[model samples]
Target chain A: MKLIVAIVRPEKLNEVLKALFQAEVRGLTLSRVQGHELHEKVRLEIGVSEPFVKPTVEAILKAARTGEVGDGKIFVLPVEKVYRIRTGEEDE
Target chain B: MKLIVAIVRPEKLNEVLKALFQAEVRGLTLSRVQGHGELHEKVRLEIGVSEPFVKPTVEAILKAARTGEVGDGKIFVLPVEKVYRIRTGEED
Candidate 1:
């Protein structure tokens, strides 16, 4: 699995959420952060299987874009393992 | 090195934080998130730790966050390529 992390303009959060929903992408965490743009930014993180990587990135990119400088960037990282805390289930 | 992203029960936040502190695993970003599964409210922690600290960090979290019930949440470990300082745009 890959973790897709995106830092985008706070205003575009709604748009990004809609895009992600449309793409059938769920399981996202949103955090409001400061810095980099010297302003407020919202961080969106999504964990997706290999097959969903492309669509997840595309969804965020298309939805969070503003044709401006602060539209933000996306970073993809390799997820070594995932475990569900309740049942102690590990993702396969 | 890896970024340990943990989605855990909100009530367990303090316990996890305390555990992390004793393990000497510091520097984390905490935020509230929704839509991960059932929108029952989860606390997400983004802790970036080095290789040596990974095991302790994960163990601390696992021990503190697990309640052996549903909605206990999950933990994800993702590889980190590089980390940079936001102010100077240089490696730290």
Candidate 2:
């Protein structure tokens, strides 16, 4: 599995979510930080099974751009384990 | 090293932080978010730690953030290759 962290433009939030849902990558967390406020970037964190990485990135990259310099970047990190807190279930 | 990202209920923030502190996990970054779908407000806690701290950190979040209910949220563990100090060009 991989954790895909995308820093995107605030204005593109809806489009990105729509694209992600269409790509069947529904689970995600979104956040805003003061540090990124100057750049107007919002962070979207998505955890996906290995095979879905490419589609997840493509969906965000395509929908989160406006042909600008700070369209933002995506970081793909290797995930060791994932736990669903409510059920104490581990996801690989 | 690993970067542990926990998505948790907003109200559980104080308890979670206290638990992490009790576990001797001081480093953390906090941010607020509205998760996917018709979601509720959530807090994203990012903690970067070495090998020995992984389990305690994860356990701390799980123990404190969980409410035995649906919105307890999740935890994602990702490998971290290195750490650096930008100003001094120092790397760890």
Candidate 3:
């Protein structure tokens, strides 16, 4: 199966999930994170921080919005096999 | 190498990690995130509140888990090149 990972504004997560669900997606995974934008001006004006940028809760929320800075990212990969623990059905 | 990603309820995170550890998986990244389900369509559902939603941290963790409610999160795996450290080429 093809894995789909998307890095989007957190606010848009609901919409994305809805879209995925409507598309008949059976399963997915998500996490919280801190991130920043690599604006050319910012990069040139200031050196990258030790951790680059510390994403504040507010920043994350802001980014999660439809159009904001430092929202989030998603990554997808291939599943060699998916075994239903209860049913033992292997989806490959 | 493959990167596995998953989005499950936040509660199931511990169990998922335990499973991964038992399965001999190594080197994971995690991030905290805000997400929602398809059934309940509200402007936004404050399903769960965790800290840190960025690429290298919380997101990595969600991508590692197995299952749960808002208590758990999501995860996926992807093909990765060799991981290297700046000081030493140590493989975890």
Candidate 4:
């Protein structure tokens, strides 16, 4: 099994979840995040704020805009094993 | 070192943290988020009701989950190195 992690804007969360469920993904995790592209801070100080600002939100939104609710980027990592706490069943 | 990230139901957070701390895990980051599973919306519409939903509140929750609270999601990123900020002559 792999762990998929995604950081996305708050508004698009529901859609992403819907898509993941439809894809038969048993479970996944999400977190709300504040992130900045290299350009955002620079423009904000330079007074060219409007264009840069919209793009930042747009980039996050675009991740969810691919005609699917959950279009955000997902990072997947391999899980070597999982042991159930109660049953102590080790599964690979 | 590998980053171990998990998304769990809000209620189970404490158990998970206690287990990890007992395992000698040093530190973690957390954030609050809103999430839904596939069955949530359909159920809401069918029953004309809202489910008992509790997830992280926002990105800041990433830092707060380590505080032993509810409704927080944590994401761990691979840190090449960790540094401490000090005035001077401090040791790690």
TM-score of the A-chain for all models: 0.91, 0.89, 0.50, 0.50
Please give me the DockQ of candidate 1 compared with the native complex: 0.07
Candidate 1 wrong stretches, greater than 4 Å: A1-92, B35-38
Q: What's the iRMSD of model 2?
A: 9.1
- Between candidates 2 and 3, name the one with more favorable TM-score: 2
Over A1-92, each residue of candidate 4 has an lDDT whose tens digit, in order, gives: 33333434355556545554454443334434322211100001011122332233333334345443223332223456666579897656
lDDT of 4 by residue, B7-87 (tens): 555555555555544444423334334455331110000000011211222222244344454433344433211111111
Candidate 4 is graded, for docking, as incorrect
lDDT of 2 by residue, A1-92 (tens): 88876667678889989999999998789877522213445778888888898788777767877765555556667778899899999988
Q: What TM-score does model 1 achieve against the real structure? A: 0.53
Model 2 misplacement above 4 A: A1-92
| Candidate 2 chain B minimal-lDDT segment of 10 residues | B83-92
TM-score of each: 0.53, 0.52, 0.34, 0.33
After superposition, candidate 4 runs with Cα above 4 Å error: A37-63, A66-72, B1-92
- Please tell me which model should have the higher DockQ, number 1 or number 4: 1
Q: Which candidate number would show the highest TM-score if scored against the true structure?
A: 1
